[PDB]
With several copies, the nearest count.
Chain A
């Protein structure tokens, strides 16, 4: 692998280093191997980074992954965008997927979750558990035909 590392004079120099690439993952075991740099070990399996190194490392790796997909395509997206998505998955304590299994199972307003998938069944246990809709979501105000608290409607105007 190629490596930009500072020289004794101060300026950064190219210094080629030997790196091992693996078909397979066992982070827990390979990191505790003599001769490796345990502070540097990496895996595309961010789920394994999440279990072994913790949530914050999970988040860090999760971004590095989303990034690399965009990057490989020669494309560039501002950090903050991917940063936000990655945090959304993360804030739960673990890894919440952007599927009906993940995000849609949240404590969010019944009408906002039904707007995505599992429409009826979401609204079914909404009535069964006797849910109270906050009506703070974009989706609820779209359904209600009211000015959603979005930019322009995120504040009340007075006299």
Chain B
């Protein structure tokens, strides 16, 4: 994530050759979607990138402190003084073909954070395993090799669909399921099942 409430998982890794490139030969370490911008309205993110680009060029720390008189225009002036189009845009060539892109890419340095929650500490699959003692139901948690909970909300979904037998298998074959002997008179779990 960026310092602007911009959560994001790696969708894919591309090697240098497949990456869009600058005429200088610069290439991104990261590609964020333009669609994650207009709704969120996190303008500071775009400004940070602008300022940070001038910072790396001039070899000066960027003043991204709040209540100041640092303007986008003022930063844009200095970036142009470096031979780059003032609003962060840069001509980029497609890694696959080498052809120029019809769109110029707003590209520059942006401080990104490597957060907790990594696929590998999260993946979990279970296909029969540890059963709780009382309930005789699959145990809880990835850590204990547990069974995922097919809650009522999920039960309701299946009903809607009209899948009577998938709902039965989910609640019997996977999870629970037991064979009890009933008295045809009192109808209770009394019967002393002396099998064999």
Interface residues of A (CB under 8 A from B): 138, 142, 145-154
11 more A-B residue pairs beyond the given contacts A151-B162, A152-B164, A154-B162, with a C-beta to C-beta distance below 8 A: A138-B159, A145-B168, A147-B168, A149-B164, A150-B162, A152-B162, A152-B165, A153-B164, A153-B165, A153-B168, A154-B164
Q: Determine whether the beta carbon of A151 is less than 8 Å from that of B172.
A: no
Q: Determine whether the beta carbon of B171 is less than 8 Å from that of A145.
A: yes
Chain A residues, CB < 8 A from B162: 150-152, 154
Q: Is the interface of B mostly helix, strand, loop or mixed?
A: helix
Given contacts A138-B159, A142-B155, A142-B171, A147 and B165 within 8 Å (CB-CB): yes
Interface residues of B (CB under 8 A from A): 155, 159, 161-165, 167-168, 171-172, 176-177
Q: Which A residue sits closest to B176, measured CB to CB?
A: A145
Q: Is the interface of A mostly helix, strand, loop or mixed?
A: loop
Given contacts A145-B168, A145-B171, A150 and B159 within 8 Å (CB-CB): yes
Q: How close is B171's CB to chain A, nearest CB, in angstroms?
A: 6
> Which single member of A138, A151, A153 contacts B161 (CB below 8 Å)?
A151
Q: Determine whether the beta carbon of B172 is less than 8 Å from that of A145.
A: yes
Q: Determine whether the beta carbon of A145 is less than 8 Å from that of B177.
A: yes
Q: Which B residue sits closest to A150, measured CB to CB?
A: B164
Q: How close is B167's CB to chain A, nearest CB, in angstroms?
A: 7
Chain A residues, CB < 8 A from B171: 142, 145
What 8 pairs across the A-B complex have the smallest Cβ distances?
A151-B162, A153-B164, A152-B164, A150-B164, A145-B172, A147-B164, A147-B168, A148-B164
Q: How close is B170's CB to chain A, nearest CB, in angstroms?
A: 10
Chain B residues, CB < 8 A from A142: 155, 167, 171
Chain A residues, CB < 8 A from B164: 147-154
Chain A residues, CB < 8 A from B167: 142, 148, 150
Q: How close is B176's CB to chain A, nearest CB, in angstroms?
A: 7
Q: Which A residue sits closest to B152, measured CB to CB?
A: A115
Q: Determine whether the beta carbon of B163 is less than 8 Å from that of A152.
A: yes
